[PDB]
């Protein structure tokens, strides 16, 4: 209600405080996570957390890496996504501002020119509604385009998940702001942009009780340079040690 879309970096101990009167499996997994990860950054529970986490993670990665070649690569992928949206019948009037706002942020985190920004201003922009929500919406359009482009491949997964056709799913569950995401969204966004993602899965799962670890899921369109924390219902950003 009063919380920002994206929080400050926090030591992992703040995560352990959330569970210190819950399950010991979770406390032990958070111990191990502390072994492998320095910090986390929370995102707001408004339904957009996967896209918000991905957005900030990626923009901050470009800021700190200054990887101009990765930017050239992704810009090519974004052009291709514009073309598939048009081929699907979306006119530019329906999505152009979302693309141009994200491209502006991407170019801004690159150093050495007039409108270059630093980390504090990047956090300001990802906390501002009229920038952050538009970038989230950019990612939702990209996701929707990739899902519909591959409708035939995604069809049986989606109809099992939701008893919806692929277009119904895109319209009702991908494009609206505030709609939670799931496995299909992550695969589609990761493939459409060609950026890998590691999701650390923090749950009560165990196979040998007394032998517990945090398992993960990789999306690799070489460890992923985007790492997210998943707990059932919610995504945040993790920082490796």
């Amino acid at each position: 209600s009063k919380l920002p879309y994206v929080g400050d970096k926090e030591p992992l101990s703040t995560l352990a405080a959330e569970f210190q009167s819950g399950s010991p499996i979770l406390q032990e997994k958070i111990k191990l996570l502390g072994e492998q990860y320095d910090a986390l950054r929370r995102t707001r529970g408004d339904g957009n957390c996967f896209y918000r986490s991905f957005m900030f993670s990626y923009l901050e990665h470009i800021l700190e890496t200054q990887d101009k070649a990765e930017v050239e690569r992704i810009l090519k992928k974004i052009e291709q996504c514009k073309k598939t949206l048009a081929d699907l019948g979306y006119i530019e009037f329906t999505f152009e501002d979302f693309f141009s706002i994200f491209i502006d942020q991407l170019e801004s985190v690159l150093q050495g020119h007039e409108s270059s920004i630093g980390a504090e201003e990047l956090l300001e922009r990802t906390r501002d509604q009229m920038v952050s929500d538009y970038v989230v919406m950019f990612f939702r359009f990209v996701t929707s385009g990739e899902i519909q482009r591959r409708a035939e491949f995604f069809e049986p997964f989606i109809s099992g998940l939701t008893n919806s056709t692929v277009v119904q799913f895109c319209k009702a569950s991908v494009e609206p702001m505030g709609e939670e995401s799931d496995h299909v969204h992550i695969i589609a966004l990761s493939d459409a942009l060609g950026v890998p993602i590691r999701v650390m899965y923090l749950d009560r799962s165990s196979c040998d009780a007394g032998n517990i670890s945090v398992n993960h899921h990789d999306f690799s369109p070489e460890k992923p340079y985007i790492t997210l924390l998943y707990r059932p219902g919610h995504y945040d950003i993790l920082y490796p040690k």
């Binding site: 957390c49 491949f153 799931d182 496995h183 299909v184 899921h217 998943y230 707990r231």
Partner: protein
């Protein structure tokens, strides 16, 4: 018998089962081959999600049927 499980990356996992295998048993086989905790798996056959209690015959999953696997990753 053999069945196949398609994943969202385009991979097919082949498994050995009988019609009297639980859905839990199938997820444990999937963990054996892929390392995915059964708690995190969602199995689909013909537009319906398969329930842990029931078995392969209940969903009429026959010889060389194809299931679909999605991970439990819903999040806001």
């Amino acid at each position: 018998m053999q069945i196949f499980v398609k994943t969202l990356t385009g991979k097919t996992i082949t498994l050995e089962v009988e019609p009297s295998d639980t859905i839990e048993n199938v997820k444990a086989k999937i963990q054996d081959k892929e390392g995915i905790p059964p708690d995190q798996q969602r199995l689909i056959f013909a537009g319906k999600q398969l329930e842990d209690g029931r078995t392969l015959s209940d969903y009429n999953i026959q010889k060389e049927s194809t299931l679909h696997l999605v991970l439990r990753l819903r999040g806001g």
